[PDB]
Amino acid sequence: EDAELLVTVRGGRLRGIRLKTPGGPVSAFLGIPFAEPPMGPRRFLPPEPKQPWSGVVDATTFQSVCYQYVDTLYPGFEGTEMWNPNRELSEDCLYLNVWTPYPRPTSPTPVLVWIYGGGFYSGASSLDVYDGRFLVQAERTVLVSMNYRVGAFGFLALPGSREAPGNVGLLDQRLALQWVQENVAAFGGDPTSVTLFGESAGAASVGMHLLSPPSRGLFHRAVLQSGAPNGPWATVGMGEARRRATQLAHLVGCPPGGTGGNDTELVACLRTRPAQVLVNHEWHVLPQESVFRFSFVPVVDGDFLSDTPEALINAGDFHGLQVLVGVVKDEGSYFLVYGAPGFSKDNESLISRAEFLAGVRVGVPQVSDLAAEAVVLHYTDWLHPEDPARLREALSDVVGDHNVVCPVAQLAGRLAAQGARVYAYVFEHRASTLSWPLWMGVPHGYEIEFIFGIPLDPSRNYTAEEKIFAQRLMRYWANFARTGDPNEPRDPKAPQWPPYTAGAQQYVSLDLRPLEVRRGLRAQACAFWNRFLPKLLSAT
Template sequence: MWNPNTPVSEDCLYLNVWGPHYKTPTPRPEDRVPVLVWIYGGAFVSGTSTLDVYQGHFLCKSQNVVVVSMNYRLGPLGFLAINGNQHIRGNQGLLDQRLALKWVVDNIAAFGGDPKKITIFGESAGAASVGFHLVSPGSQGLFQRAVMQSGAPNAAWAIATKNEIYERSLKLAKLINCPVDYPARLEYCLLNADPKNLFLKQYENLVPPSVLPYPFVPHIDGDFVPSDIETLLNSSTLPNKELLIGLNKDEGTYFLFYGMPGFTREGESLITRKNFIEGLPLVMTNSSEIVKEAGISYYTDWRDENNTKSNRDEMARMVGDSLFNCPVVDFATRYAERGGKTFFYFFDHVSSKNPWPKWAGAMHGYEIEFVFGMPLNPVLKYQQDEITLANKTMQHYGDFARTGNPKFKGGDWPLFKANTQEYLSLNDDSTGVKKMLKANECHLWNNLFPKFQNMSDILRRCSSSGIVQYNWVFLLILLVISLTH
């Protein structure tokens, strides 16, 4: 479902539009409908708007909306940056998205869309992109509402510093034999490099091994991304747009099949304790040893630490919590705290068409087929309850695009607030309101782990071994207290 169905090309800046049928050649202003603009995911390294799962005709027809999807540059073509070079400044992929949004504002009325009622929505890196537009001053005025599915710009995999991108870019330039000491020649070499070679070389040790080892992502450039996400969310100058944001039940399982020790694409992947310990550094790549020990402690069932099923499930939970669950909950909480009207969903249906092992559950990305109404295609022979779920999901999106409230059983969807964190559970047999999703796990990832990491960094800089020894004991005591309360 995710494999590209069109040739890979640097010439990719196209968009697609699905609009209602009108009896008149030019839609009248009073007939204009809301617009939903899709931004695909793929870790900022892969993806295309042409995938079958992104086809917008069912969503367009069922909700009487205009649906737009876009392409944007990826990997080094989209996010490589050279220090001091005005032509290769980075974040090209985000600028491509902004240009597409400007086109929509200027032209969508000709397709029957209302340029004053635009909702951007995306999944994974697409959701992180939506988040970047939400906090970027230059994107304000191009849309009114936003939907973020399983991704956020504050996730470690979604954002880098200037220096990180500069260093990775120079490493890549050296790998393709560009002269890095001569700015003009470096620029000429990069601009004339084979795009396929650039893409292949980006995987050669530019970043430490990890579960998501992709070096070229958006960075804090002082322009599109003026500062870190927390600072931007605290800014009083940004407007508070309505936000629908959410997660799938088993966000982590998809990524286990791509290089995590002991996991295979067939069978139960019952991993050993050794596999679990070997896999942990790929999740907590930049963490100190004490933080890794805390991770092991929290995600181990100490009643039976060698239980292979438990080791598998806990590794899946750790990957999901670190990459998606806790960054998304953190973004939603901060956005709600600043006054943004926020709605949260939790998708826990396992598609009957999911080709992965059953234990993998409601995986990352597998809500998209319901958002776009894929089960309504009779050729695919989805189950009747899945057709119902697809219609219900599209109705939520249509209501949100029209009114700013996704609605719930004819009433209002409860607001997600920092103190109560109410969210809606979406599945085929029941839909109910719950509270405090992943509260314990996200307290760990969003609060305790950063504090322990900061303390570890301070201790590393201490010159006196006596002070270091004393402080490590103090840190261990704090760790035990924190994890047992």
């Protein structure tokens, strides 16, 4: 039994821990170092592989969370605290976790690699909602999740320089993927069947690995949940990245008045500042007030991304690839209480017409006044142009379509039309234990707990129907990891899940009811964002 907790990898030996589930035990190896601690002169630098170690590295608990901003707008509120760090913050944070079935698989098993979201400024693999013990037990797969540097530590970019090239957080994920290739077999996992899946910025990170050649060889399938690399928030230009990095330096006293200028002196001054000092000024460098916008994100500089995600998606050859994409029913709802006027999570947020018009400029920042009018045209119900409830749902749709649904829809249609086999879904079940207000419906990120089988946790208060619903979702994700097809391999009685095509645009609804096939991922609204609005911006 406890001999299963002893595994040797290329770096050395490891001791794991045995976790309990209602259906049996699993073996987890939490806190495996896959990189040298990116500290001191290594801040902002690409990761280096962890040197081999003597003795047995204890891997029985999660390691430290990378330095990140902490949401403190609602102390003690479950809806926000569940995403906050549950371990101490540290720059020594490049650790990964491996869950493997008990008994250990004797034949190679497909591997699921999780990349957490959080706007590229937050997140951790140690969060309770990312506990992979239920997915591994119920579906007999191998699950891996890694920590990657977020915020300035992972994505501050002075493009062209060696001291801070940017995208090192994406290189942290890649190094963890190279680690899975070289070591996941020691846990019973098949390195020839690796499926990346992520949510929010983790879904965008997956898409960027699909578009980066050095990462394409490290996995074979991809799942993008509520995120895409082509969104208006997932990338930033070289000129803007340099300005955001320079503004952060000025706010922390870099350069010292007034000797300084070039990137070497600026980064050297940044590396002497305490990590928390850099965190405390992260939101100051945004150009205007907004929601769903983040300071330090992947930068398009020609290295990791040789072109914009849109350019690479349009010019890509995706034959032989299987992708699973999807969104939740209410992508933009929770963001509204983070900047839109008239919005509060503790009332009904029945905004006025004036508040809706001002909120459009917050949910769609830096666009012209004419473009904002075009947004108001599409999302105003002109039969009830001042109904507060409709204006509330309209602004949520504005933020959700512009940031998630339509970037995902453009990616899915392009992938399916250029070789890849695509499966699309819309998650429509609102968890019974959801602490956010009812009007938010199914907010961004609240399909994850069902994908990871959290309702099976006996200490939670989920319903019996939600546990069955979670098992069906884990079966979908595991079938896709095993064979590239979420449908049961040889089950005709259950309703079937058809692939997504650019012409039929078919997707399924994931809720307590059986599968239901629908068409169009908000085709009318996404024609405005993906087709017309760029023409409106170019002409003006």
